[PDB]
Design an enzyme around this catalytic site. Structure first.
Site, PDB file in Angstrom:
ATOM      1  N   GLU A  60      54.371  46.912  65.855  1.00 29.61           N
ATOM      2  CA  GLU A  60      53.912  47.100  64.450  1.00 29.61           C
ATOM      3  C   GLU A  60      52.856  46.045  64.093  1.00 29.61           C
ATOM      4  O   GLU A  60      51.792  46.428  63.561  1.00 29.61           O
ATOM      5  CB  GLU A  60      55.108  47.035  63.496  1.00 29.61           C
ATOM      6  N   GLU A 285      69.508  12.058  40.367  1.00 29.09           N
ATOM      7  CA  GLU A 285      70.102  12.074  39.003  1.00 29.09           C
ATOM      8  C   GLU A 285      69.031  11.801  37.941  1.00 29.09           C
ATOM      9  O   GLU A 285      69.093  12.444  36.872  1.00 29.09           O
ATOM     10  CB  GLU A 285      71.231  11.050  38.905  1.00 29.09           C
ATOM     11  CG  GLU A 285      72.597  11.684  39.027  1.00 29.09           C
ATOM     12  CD  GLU A 285      73.708  10.755  39.480  1.00 29.09           C
ATOM     13  OE1 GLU A 285      73.738   9.595  39.021  1.00 29.09           O
ATOM     14  OE2 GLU A 285      74.547  11.203  40.287  1.00 29.09           O
TER      15      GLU A 285
HETATM   16  N1  LIG Z   1      69.136  -4.092  30.234  1.00 25.65           N
HETATM   17  C1  LIG Z   1      70.454  -3.938  30.317  1.00 25.65           C
HETATM   18  N2  LIG Z   1      71.254  -4.968  29.951  1.00 25.65           N
HETATM   19  C2  LIG Z   1      72.581  -4.811  30.038  1.00 25.65           C
HETATM   20  N3  LIG Z   1      73.279  -3.759  30.459  1.00 25.65           N
HETATM   21  C3  LIG Z   1      72.457  -2.759  30.819  1.00 25.65           C
HETATM   22  C4  LIG Z   1      71.081  -2.763  30.778  1.00 25.65           C
HETATM   23  N4  LIG Z   1      70.585  -1.545  31.228  1.00 25.65           N
HETATM   24  C5  LIG Z   1      71.651  -0.839  31.527  1.00 25.65           C
HETATM   25  N5  LIG Z   1      72.817  -1.526  31.294  1.00 25.65           N
HETATM   26  C6  LIG Z   1      74.184  -1.071  31.529  1.00 25.65           C
HETATM   27  O1  LIG Z   1      74.200  -0.385  32.759  1.00 25.65           O
HETATM   28  C7  LIG Z   1      74.862   0.895  32.629  1.00 25.65           C
HETATM   29  C8  LIG Z   1      74.196   1.881  33.557  1.00 25.65           C
HETATM   30  O2  LIG Z   1      74.507   1.533  34.927  1.00 25.65           O
HETATM   31  P1  LIG Z   1      74.094   2.554  36.090  1.00 25.65           P
HETATM   32  O3  LIG Z   1      72.771   3.162  35.766  1.00 25.65           O
HETATM   33  O4  LIG Z   1      74.264   1.891  37.416  1.00 25.65           O
HETATM   34  O5  LIG Z   1      75.234   3.663  35.908  1.00 25.65           O
HETATM   35  P2  LIG Z   1      75.877   4.724  36.917  1.00 25.65           P
HETATM   36  O6  LIG Z   1      77.270   4.298  37.233  1.00 25.65           O
HETATM   37  O7  LIG Z   1      74.910   4.970  38.023  1.00 25.65           O
HETATM   38  O8  LIG Z   1      75.953   6.033  35.998  1.00 25.65           O
HETATM   39  P3  LIG Z   1      75.462   7.559  36.216  1.00 25.65           P
HETATM   40  O9  LIG Z   1      76.677   8.360  36.634  1.00 25.65           O
HETATM   41  O10 LIG Z   1      74.905   7.997  34.881  1.00 25.65           O
HETATM   42  O11 LIG Z   1      74.405   7.502  37.296  1.00 25.65           O
HETATM   43  C9  LIG Z   1      74.791   1.234  31.138  1.00 25.65           C
HETATM   44  O12 LIG Z   1      75.940   1.967  30.731  1.00 25.65           O
HETATM   45  C10 LIG Z   1      74.737  -0.137  30.457  1.00 25.65           C
HETATM   46  O13 LIG Z   1      76.012  -0.607  30.083  1.00 25.65           O
HETATM   47 MG   LIG Z   2      74.297   6.981  39.581  1.00 23.12          MG
END
Ligand SMILES: Nc1ncnc2c1ncn2[C@@H]1O[C@H](COP(=O)(O)OP(=O)(O)OP(=O)(O)O)[C@@H](O)[C@H]1O
Ligand SMILES: [Mg+2]
Ligand SMILES: Nc1ncnc2c1ncn2[C@@H]1O[C@H](COP(=O)(O)OP(=O)(O)OP(=O)(O)O)[C@@H](O)[C@H]1O
Ligand SMILES: Nc1ncnc2c1ncn2[C@@H]1O[C@H](COP(=O)(O)OP(=O)(O)OP(=O)(O)O)[C@@H](O)[C@H]1O
Ligand SMILES: Nc1ncnc2c1ncn2[C@@H]1O[C@H](COP(=O)(O)OP(=O)(O)OP(=O)(O)O)[C@@H](O)[C@H]1O
Ligand SMILES: Nc1ncnc2c1ncn2[C@@H]1O[C@H](COP(=O)(O)OP(=O)(O)O)[C@@H](O)[C@H]1O
Ligand SMILES: Nc1ncnc2c1ncn2[C@@H]1O[C@H](COP(=O)(O)OP(=O)(O)O)[C@@H](O)[C@H]1O
Ligand SMILES: Nc1ncnc2c1ncn2[C@@H]1O[C@H](COP(=O)(O)OP(=O)(O)O)[C@@H](O)[C@H]1O
Ligand SMILES: [Mg+2]
Ligand SMILES: [Mg+2]
Ligand SMILES: [Mg+2]
EC number: 2.7.11.1
Lengths: 464, 467, 464
Positions: A60, A285
């Protein structure tokens, strides 16, 4: 029974040497499964690897169409033909009896003219457009067997798990039968090659995930370590593992949303770049911007990590493609980049919609490939329940993991404080204390344990 | 390394990475009302109206007036294209009162009599309607058309779904490219999902991609390339902004989870207003409450929804989660955003749309809504009602917490035979947040974030204990 | 442009009606309401739009159509002799060219604008039906007469036709279905397609009453006032901040024997005593039984019944389908025109039906109530008598504006109950789990449990 190498990555292992010599193999499958690609990638290898000419019988597709099709793979079927190492025998009636008789002689002529050992008729079904078919096939296969040359027979099927042919006579006529499938997993497509049987020798029984790419068919068979310590980027965390993470280990961060997995990954990626070691960050994510920005909240300039050619951020959606496709996209960038350490944030994302078996196979492939390349990899998993979780993972993939850094929320008085813990450490001592840790603009801060508290696991501790 | 042709179909150009194979035949099979004829019509219009190339249309059942009339529904005057010498509805209709070579020779006329590059034969199933009797004929037309060097768009019919790609189970292998139009229905709702099964010689997006037919043609739904900033926006509660370390992030997804009647709908009202106070545009998608009950309920909080409604700074779009499929719902949101163009969006509630829908199909929606909200720099607050009022073990039953940046967990606390509430910022990406379960009360001035339950244990459970 | 069929709902599903000058195909199983649709489609255009309609029969005698039309109170006889409607018999006394010949003729003797053919199946053959179909279809389009061709089917979700040729042969296809949801049936109309203009997709629940086909589509554009109404319990009126709302939906949730039927009855008495009309849809108890327990609570239903102020209707949750139940609800609502509607209970109606099919019914009665300035109190009995973590097992708490929580509390070997206003959409309510005792003169809402912890678990602990 001697076998012939197909040079198709995976297939040589699945058949245990390749396809039986001086015998015709049947390769049936639905539309767009990669049947014609399996025949044009068969001969394509026997010229640029063993210098043994090949013939292609088309029923074909025009000799120019296939010449243009192999152009996407980067193969020149026009230079191989003009170099006398390939010949496309056109069988398409240019706008039922002596057809076979004639065509057979036209094949024997070319095969006995080009000194070729591999042939492939694609497709034999189209030509017949049971007794007559299954009967007039025996003659073709027989005559093919008489010239003592292994061939590939391209056949088509309507259903995905129904009949393994079209007339029911395509089978029970061929000695060796390979089935290419494009199984629909809800809304995603997963191609799986399975060798139904191989008359004579043994092979791999069952289905094996593959994918078509610039390199061709990439099949992946399942049935196919120093004590050097490595920093995690957290001073206190390296102490809770008795020196740090093993150069050839798989670290796994687990816990609820907002626990600090993404933070641990960032520091486990920046520490590499700090020690002239490159690392890949497989984001799923959030986007690169959010990583850079949220990373920038804790310092670690993720921009300078790209300018130094030590950091590669690969962000893409967990449903953008299928596991088989994802795994290929992972291993691929690893080879191009040659990273000291990789990071998948997160695994739970890739477990959304995919079946546990298909997931388990994926994790094993990624981890296995990472472990057999001296590349330290960290994997993030989000727990469904933010508190009271009785399972570290709901996927049951802990046995594959070497280290486990379990994070969880602790309800202290009327506040929410996280708690870092080294669940297990393969081939080393670890801290067995559920330590509490805060998050600041300078990253993580591990402190004391909850020695004066009870029911910490539950997420609602009790004082004494 | 294959010549591709843009179809100008919203999405289809992203699925095949350029469009369809040049000078090659493309099969578009599917059941009745899938959008086979529409697709083909859009393949011509888009082809001629942009690149300025002549198209040929081989009609079988419908007459060269019906296509011109039906196509007018999407604002396509074939009358202008039929008379300008761009299109040509080549009629092949059985007279109201196996000559394949005939039409094949007739088709070449118009093709060469216009200097074409595109063609489309509507339902080549109506010619044959013996598998071998079809394949030979089919192959001839595709093979013949191939020498012409014109891109042909075939259209076949399907009896049953999730079975044969065509009717004779041969047409698929008779063409180079095979696109399958689906109209699968889960329960009593429908869903249009276009997919490229095969594309000989090149690459494409495998799997099923959700689309919807509209008054602008077939709208397909296909990369994590967005933006991010440290710009903070107010939530409507100063107490809440302090708990987020200044207020919510501008480009971010906020999810307020909690039991039935915890203040989720209250926080939305106060969030959709702070946009109107800063002369910013905000949309509200209510899938539980009505514009009357919403405006009324919100009035017992000194919020004049009616006023902001007339100031063209607020839009309330109430609709039922079972009124249409998840595909239509998404198009509506995207349409209302491209029309009003808000800086803040509000979906109340996400749990409403999860009712009677597969988690996978629902996840895709949240990724589609959230994704399109982040790339457009539009602040999105989503509400989710927990199935459990007290003793909520997981943050979301749909498991979409990994796709949100800021989380505000509201819940009841049985304290001394009473039933108080407690707001808490569970997580905040790229920012510090108060990590305390603060008690709050509702009144005629909205929320009241008071102190925490410092002298209480097992607050998350529902029944706190005295220490 | 479409021709309004004036069928309850269908005019909304089709976004106007049937395309003018185009034949719409209507297929279904035997007894799906094909003939009816074809009949009701003509009788409407004649009785309202004043458009002469022609009915083509093939198996049914012209004296049977008018014989069955009387069932819906439609006088076809008058219309026949009046020349507004003409029934053309094409059923041989106990060929295709002569059909359209007589048809075209019979469509000009009265200047007919609507034509109904039942059926295009009894006439027939392989592709003949796919050839003989276009002949009529193309002939009708030539006379710009909106036709209601039928089709026959044996499978509900199988083929859309009895040949599978007429499917994509027409332009507008409507599919009727009599799906067997276990032991009960569910009629559902659906518009498969319509070349030119938009329409509603998916299935839609319809019923067949003495007024023809009643299809219930979708549209959240009612009203909302601050008019406060009583509940029958004085202290229960103060726990909501001045009683219930006229334009609101109330729900009474709890185990078995909490006081749901006691609080329902009191809601019907207040309407009566205030000279207002009220209806009780009892699905668990009986008239005689409801008339007894009520008298044992101090209120009398005979008096309220004899005063044509309180209508009581009792039936079984399995007696008919949700679509049928809803009909009786909407039907018995209009005639009586009540100020308050009570359903006891939604739990009994949820049992056996699917959660999705249940929500739809709850969105029907709920929507219809709120859209009629009528108050509605619905009773839902929980499956767990102690230790429930959900207000409803069907998750319909988002549909309800006000929720009443009745639960048992094991207190020092005694099983006392407890009332509590869980939520009040647009009002202040008492946020306390007040204990209440049931007796002769109805319920006694006393003090709460200030000296008890974990009361919402059923088994609390006194904290002195
Ligand atoms: N500048 C900052 N100062 C202090 N704490 C912070 C700051 N930025 C983020 N956080 C903290 O870090 C957390 C986020 O941590 P991370 O991104 O590692 O989460 P994760 O466990 O990966 O969550 P997910 O399931 O959404 O990926 C926030 O809930 C907050 O409490
Ligand atoms: Mg995560
Ligand atoms: N460069 C490429 N990148 C990605 N996918 C490709 C590439 N080239 C081919 N493919 C895929 O491989 C398949 C090629 O079709 P092939 O001719 O190998 O299959 P087939 O089984 O012979 O089907 P048919 O019956 O249509 O001829 C398609 O699914 C196509 O999408
Ligand atoms: N004027 C008011 N004064 C005091 N409390 C009020 C007032 N209006 C409402 N409330 C309280 O606030 C609640 C409002 O709940 P809201 O709808 O904001 O939250 P929700 O959790 O989204 O609710 P739902 O589950 O119905 O969607 C009422 O149930 C009531 O308890
Ligand atoms: N005369 C009375 N004196 C005291 N208590 C009474 C009297 N009559 C009824 N009760 C109480 O009322 C309860 C029944 O109330 P009701 O019928 O409203 O229950 P329910 O919550 O609707 O439950 P279900 O519908 O499952 O029967 C009895 O179990 C009893 O305790
Ligand atoms: N050298 C070591 N010193 C102390 N503890 C160790 C050592 N090696 C392993 N362990 C402990 O044993 C665990 C693993 O033991 P293993 O037999 O593999 O258990 P399992 O089969 O349950 O995974 C480690 O996580 C750690 O807790
Ligand atoms: N203006 C419009 N708005 C929305 N849907 C439309 C519009 N015009 C047509 N449609 C829809 O298009 C579909 C018809 O698609 P069509 O091209 O005829 O494909 P097929 O031949 O596979 O049925 C129907 O479902 C119809 O409702
Ligand atoms: N007067 C009536 N009141 C209520 N239901 C009726 C009445 N007459 C008929 N029905 C019901 O409606 C159905 C209508 O059937 P019909 O319109 O002939 O459909 P079909 O042609 O698909 O069999 C009957 O089979 C019966 O179940
Ligand atoms: Mg092929
Ligand atoms: Mg609400
Ligand atoms: Mg009762």
């Amino acid at each position: 029974i001697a076998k012939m190498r197909t040079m198709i990555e995976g297939f040589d292992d699945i058949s245990h040497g390749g396809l039986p010599i001086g015998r015709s193999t049947l390769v049936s499958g639905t539309s767009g499964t990669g049947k014609t690609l399996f025949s044009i990638q068969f001969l394509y290898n026997g010229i640029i690897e063993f210098d043994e000419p090949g013939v292609f019988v088309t029923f074909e597709e025009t000799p120019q169409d296939i010449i243009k099709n192999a152009r996407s793979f980067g193969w020149d079927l026009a230079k191989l033909v003009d170099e006398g190492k390939l010949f496309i025998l056109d069988a398409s009636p240019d706008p039922g009896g002596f057809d076979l008789s004639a065509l057979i002689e036209r094949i024997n002529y070319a095969i006995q003219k080009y000194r070729a050992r591999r042939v492939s008729i694609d497709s034999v079904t189209s030509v017949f457009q049971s007794s007559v078919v299954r009967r007039e096939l025996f003659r073709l296969v027989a005559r093919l067997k008489q010239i003592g040359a292994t061939t590939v027979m391209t056949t088509e099927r309507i259903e995905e798990y129904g009949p393994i042919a079209r007339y029911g006579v395509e089978e029970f006529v061929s000695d060796n039968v390979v089935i290419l499938r494009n199984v629909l997993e809800g809304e995603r497509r997963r191609r799986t090659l399975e060798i139904l049987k191989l008359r004579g020798t043994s092979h791999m029984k069952g289905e094996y995930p593959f994918t078509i790419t610039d390199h061709g068919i990439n099949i992946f068979p399942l049935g196919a370590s120093s004590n050097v310590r490595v920093s995690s980027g957290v001073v206190r965390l390296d102490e809770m593992c008795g020196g740090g993470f093993f150069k050839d280990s798989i670290i796994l961060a687990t816990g609820a949303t907002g626990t600090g997995k993404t933070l641990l990954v960032s520091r486990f990626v920046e520490n590499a770049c700090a020690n002239k070691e490159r690392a890949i960050l497989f984001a799923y994510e959030e986007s690169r911007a959010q990583l850079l920005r949220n990373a920038y909240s804790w310092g670690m300039d993720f921009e300078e990590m790209e300018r130094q050619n030590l950091l590669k951020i690969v962000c893409a959606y967990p449903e953008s493609a299928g596991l088989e496709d994802h795994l290929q996209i992972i291993k691929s960038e690893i080879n191009d980049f040659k990273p000291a350490r990789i990071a998948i944030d997160s695994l739970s994302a890739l477990a959304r919609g995919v079946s546990n078996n298909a997931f388990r196979q994926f994790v094993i492939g990624v981890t296995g490939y990472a472990k057999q390349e001296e590349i330290t990899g960290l994997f993030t998993n989000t727990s469904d329940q933010f508190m009271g979780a009785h399972s570290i993972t709901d996927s049951h993939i802990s046995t594959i993991t070497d280290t486990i850094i379990l994070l969880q929320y602790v309800e202290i008085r009327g506040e929410m404080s996280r708690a870092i813990n080294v669940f297990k450490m393969r081939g080393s001592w670890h801290d067995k204390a559920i330590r509490e840790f805060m998050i600041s603009d300078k990253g993580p801060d591990i402190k004391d344990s909850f020695r004066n508290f009870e029911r910490i696991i539950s997420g609602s501790p009790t004082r004494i």
